């Protein structure tokens, strides 16, 4: 039940019954689908830079509370994240933070230390069993000179300038035994949360010193082999301030660790290392991208000088005494947190003040929580503020430059309901990058559903904004990579009343269609055929009784809108892009994404061919075309037909270091109108003649 | 340069002044300090270029030096569990060791330092300043630094590996050609060492044997990066002196293109399919 695996002695160990434990799921190698969206959100933990992620690992990279619609992290993009995870899109995550987020949680450990005469107790035999007037006997010796300890666990205070003293704490005057000034507080260790969130405030840790009789029985052989006393260490985490903790196991599925003080505690018999910080950090963490898990604690810090000084003092005092080894190396054997050796013989001449005396009891049942931290101000208002802060400053951001094609493979951006001020900073993505695609919405999710006139006004404003980023600045071709979707409703996949726009529905459709990890469109999910042309994740849509004039005006202004299919459902009569000219090639919206992917293939060709000494002009020209055609052929499901041509024109001859490519592509459109008429015949002249 | 401090970095360039068969790779990083920012990279690059400019290839005619290169960047060594920072000169050093280090003195075609999998970083991770702006990258290129870019989400690659030759010549623009020329300079020394101080030679035999030696040693060694030709003779000054003869090598090389364009035209499906 209690004793652990010490060696090879034939034996069967029983670990009791237990309830199911969550198992971290292994991930797969990343790839580039044709639909690669970027999603910005508030989270619980994880990195704060754009990250290409496979949806299997979202839960354990960003915490599983970020996708809960009832939690504190819900914003108007959580439905988008959930739909992406359900469909299985490798997408790019960006975790934002509010402008007023506090620092991390911290906890420092210290000992109040003094020397003085104290009492001594009876002994039954050499086992030194008697203590604290056990049985019926008063303590025996009148006064025995010894030491008094009182442990302290408390928040690490910051500097007056607003900087934490994580590694820069110093000793101070104590409070126990103030009759003698030397009563001093000396620090022993520091602990800090890895992230900035309430997870730190809810994280807890335990440290204790077991003996032969503990529930996790210790062994004296290992301590003799390597002279150092071994302490048990445990990490726990709770759900909320009112719940109860649950053990955070190591990557090898263990509840606790054994650690010790010293330089390098290597066991020759098995080559295992018992160093405190090294062992903790190596056992509780796993950075491998496929099996990824980060412990809430950061790397612990230890005050070696002070711990060594206290150990030396207690050794010099009582190591040359009746029931403790006097040797020099026993310094690290000295039991500090407890008051006895591994066999369980109490240290007389040492007194640890209990709870009533103002101390802290370090046992397996005591729990200690980090102090401080927080998430910041959450909600849609702060989310919009942060999103605007990121999007407005794209050309001079010091956090990341998102004109990097190779490092940021995202190619799509969906407007999930940002406010109108943030909406107008989105169009510049298709101006700054030549392989990007945008979907916009005319509804501000935090306001009331717009009327017909407000729809028209917002649509006109967005068209005006889009008019400033032509596809070809040289020839002024109007933009065609994206679309605008009008309408809003309510989310159906949840009991709560949670309004969403129809960009969510089209987002799900595109995820299912062009989201395969092998880079080929799936014919069974064609966004304009079968059951994928109906609304499926939105209900109670507004403005369904548009007049004919209103519908005609919206169509002429190039919006995408729905109609009633039957008494229960809606559908899309035609899904066009916001191209403003009369060309029928660029009328469909999926063709825009196809063209974006073509632009990506061109970059890949360059990346592969650039900067080679021994190439020739003909080989360069041929290899460029080979690359583009091989990559693009057979992936667009017959929506396009394209052809590349590389060459070295006269300007390239002049320059001497450049070559040119040009892709010719063609597409179709759709019919939308039907006529109807009838004629009356007599039965005979209709049946024959 | 494996990461010497900036004081020691400035005593290395004199090797390509004191010897005619030497090749130096410099690093803009001090491994004992923090990873440098863009401005510090630029400052150290300018200082190293100023130091290098004092040792022209030809003192008689002031040809700018071209034997070596400067590499910027730093990261962490991947072949160890510990945390051990290193500069990218280590990765280039490994590439060159594999390419041009065979004991038989002929370049290996299967490890070309700018083809295949040798043009990517392989022994460094967590490189810094990978979000350079276009202006920063352009300035570094115009100052003749070698820097890496992102290949994909996982790795990096060298867009172009050039030497610190500062002129407009396209012959001396690749770093490998400098090493090739250093080897040529070694071959000339070998020819002299063999032919010096012989009683019974004639002038014609001396002249012929020098060219024979250089050509035989060099031909078939440089994997088609260079083409060279030696010429030995006895000029009028050599006639006047009476104990000297002259040799002169003519060589040529190429460069590499680095910029691509992109354009598109939209056709209707029928006129693109047939017409």
Residue numbers in the entry:
A (entry chain L): 1 to 689
B (entry chain A): 415 to 689
Q: Which of the paper's sentences describe this entry?
A:
We observe the tail fibers are branched and rearranged dramatically upon cell surface attachment. This complex configuration involves fourteen putative tail fibers with depolymerase activity that provide ϕKp24 with the ability to infect a broad panel of capsular polysaccharide (CPS) types of Klebsiella pneumoniae. In this study, we combine cryo-electron microscopy methods, protein structure prediction methods, molecular simulations, microbiological and machine learning approaches to explore the capsid, tail, and tail fibers of ϕKp24.
The full-length sheath protein is composed of outer and central sheath components. The outer sheath component (light blue) is located at the tip of the sheath monomer, pointing outwards. The central sheath component (orange, and dark blue) consists of the C-terminal domain, N-terminal domain, and two long extensions. The central sheath is essential in sheath assembly and contraction. To facilitate the interactions between tail sheath proteins in the tail, the two long extensions from the central sheath (the N-terminal extension, residues M1—S21; the C-terminal extension, residues A667—G689) can connect to the C-terminal domains of two adjacent gp118 proteins located in the ring below. Additionally, the C-terminal domain can connect with two adjacent sheath proteins located in the upper ring. Furthermore, the structure solved here suggests that the subunit-connecting extensions (C-terminal extension) of the sheath protein gp118 function as hinges during contraction, with the central sheath of gp118 likely maintaining its structure.
